[PDB]
């Protein structure tokens, strides 16, 4: 196999969700935070030709970027990973699958409870502002006929009473109130535009951001409330 600069771009991102990864032969990669709070999946243009577990995925990717693009990754004679360059050969360790957290299967996402979209530069402002205002939790909710995101600093405000930031995604057609709370720490998506599919059944909840490059499902906190 060979990995394009786009695939490694993607992979570096997944690495932020979980430090390792389990790659399986095919055109599909996926990962999930160890704590199961954020899941990512993507189809890639390159074909992965062997099953391998990588323990430090960030390390692996760093190494890759030190070789040419044509560098041919293959299974090592003894089983580890072999990155073979024009004049050089690197060897990276395959990991015992039992030590790397992987999602079981890609569970289909339930048909959406609510649907909206978020623009690439709005998602960026939200993330960026978030560090500055110290917004550690956000709430996708309904106000005045529109879907908005409201940021709160949960350490200084327990109830999510004082709203430090608000962003307006689009108008809302339905009659349902939903206050969907998300933990900033779990918004790991790479910057871009996303269809946003919200879903809830009772105390259960999840939000799936669906991008051009990949998808991300991320848990809504226990304090999320709704009419669904």
């Amino acid at each position: 196999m060979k990995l394009s600069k786009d695939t490694t771009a993607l992979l570096k991102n997944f690495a932020t969700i979980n430090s390792g990864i389990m790659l399986k032969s095919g055109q599909f990669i996926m990962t999930r935070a160890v704590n199961g709070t954020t899941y990512a999946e993507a189809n890639i243009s390159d074909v992965i030709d062997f099953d391998v577990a990588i323990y430090d995925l960030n390390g692996f990717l760093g190494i890759l970027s030190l070789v040419n693009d044509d560098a041919e990754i293959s299974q090592s004679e003894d089983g580890n990973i072999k990155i073979a360059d024009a004049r050089s050969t690197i060897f990276w360790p395959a990991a015992d699958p039992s030590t790397v957290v992987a999602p079981n299967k890609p569970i289909p996402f339930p048909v959406a409870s609510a649907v909206t979209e978020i623009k690439a530069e709005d998602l960026q402002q939200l993330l960026r502002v978030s560090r500055g205002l110290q917004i550690d939790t956000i709430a996708i909710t309904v106000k005045e006929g529109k879907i908005v995101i409201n940021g709160f600093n949960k350490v200084e405000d327990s109830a999510l009473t004082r709203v430090k930031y608000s962003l307006t995604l689009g108008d809302y057609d339905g009659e349902n109130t939903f206050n969907f709370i998300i933990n900033m720490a779990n918004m790991k998506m790479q910057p871009g535009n996303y269809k946003l599919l919200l879903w809830a059944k009772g105390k259960q909840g999840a939000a799936k951001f669906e991008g051009e490059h990949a998808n991300y499902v991320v848990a809504l906190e226990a304090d999320s409330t709704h009419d669904f």
Binding site: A33, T37, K203, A206, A219
Partner: protein, 319 residues
């Protein structure tokens, strides 16, 4: 079969780790108190503490989760520094699951001294999402868990069974060791060697299955191996008898026999002299042995230092 086998494991005290709460050998009450938990389906905040290793703490933690079909986060307590608790553990206690599965964080071996701050940070965190996620702590030494934490948990304490319970467990453990031999192709010649393992190191069911691995070197437990199990912690009778008889020749000779492990012997001695001697002599047997034990490792000749104990004891002990 009647025994869970992890089968990806050669190490055998772990090949044989119980998957459920029934397969667990525990005191009558704590088993029912655990049965009670799994039936209701929602697990409270628990501390399982030994101290002595091998009693079932981290097996029971995993089993409670199995039996409840929990969504379980197993975590090395040493790795829980405060940032990890604010980060990933929070990210998890907060998340909405949805498989409709109760979330359980198992913090293993959480009894470290300097994780005191991570601990203070849980006392708020445990109440905040107790709706969503419950915490099972495992520890060898409970004092290393802060009070406010104990206080937020049911503290179930392993390894101190009632004599009635102690008996039943030793019957079940023997029965187990058997079923494990069956599957490992180990032939049992004398059954006495198998019960001697169960009694020898009792509280601890790990070493107990560890000793068993040790002895299958020749794949048989014959009386020839039963001869072995008696010896290591074996009969103190020869000395106990010579102390009564108050003679020296015997004592002087017995001392070099036990020079080897003094730390073990001196323990067995105080143990059996306690019952066999007068109440007044109990207060004295401790001063004598305590003082002796205390100065071992200062003492040049350990064989003689042991001789010095024996005479001292024969003089002041009466029964």
């Amino acid at each position: 079969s009647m025994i869970t086998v992890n089968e990806k494991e050669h190490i055998l005290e772990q090949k044989y780790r119980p998957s459920t709460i029934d397969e667990c050998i525990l005191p009558a009450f704590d088993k029912e108190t655990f049965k009670s938990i799994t039936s209701k389906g929602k697990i409270p905040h628990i501390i399982l503490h030994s101290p002595s290793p091998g009693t079932g703490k981290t097996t029971v933690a995993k089993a409670l989760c199995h039996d409840v079909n929990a969504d379980m986060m197993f975590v090395n307590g040493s790795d829980c520094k405060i940032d990890f608790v604010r980060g990933p553990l929070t990210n998890f206690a907060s998340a909405a699951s949805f498989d409709g599965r109760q979330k359980v964080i198992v913090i293993d071996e959480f009894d470290r001294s300097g994780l005191a701050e991570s601990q203070r940070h849980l006392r708020s965190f445990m109440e905040a999402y107790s709706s969503n996620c419950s915490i099972i702590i495992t520890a060898n030494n409970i004092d290393g868990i802060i009070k406010p934490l104990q206080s937020r948990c049911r503290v179930i304490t392993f390894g101190q069974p009632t004599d009635e319970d102690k008996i039943e467990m030793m019957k079940q453990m023997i029965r187990r060791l058997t079923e494990i031999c069956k599957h490992e192709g180990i032939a049992i010649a004398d059954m006495k060697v198998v019960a001697a393992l169960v009694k020898k190191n009792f509280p601890d069911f790990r070493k107990t299955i560890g000793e068993l691995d040790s002895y299958s070197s020749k794949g048989v437990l014959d009386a020839g191996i039963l001869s072995l199990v008696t010896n290591d912690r074996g009969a103190i009778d020869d000395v106990l008898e010579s102390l009564k008889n108050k003679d020296v020749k015997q004592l002087r000779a017995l001392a070099p026999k036990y020079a080897a492990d003094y730390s073990w012997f001196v323990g067995k001695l105080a143990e059996e002299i306690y019952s066999r001697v007068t109440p007044q002599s109990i207060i004295r047997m401790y001063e004598i042995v305590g003082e002796n034990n205390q100065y071992h490792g200062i003492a040049a000749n350990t064989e003689l230092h042991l001789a010095y104990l024996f005479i001292q004891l024969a003089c002041e002990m009466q029964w």
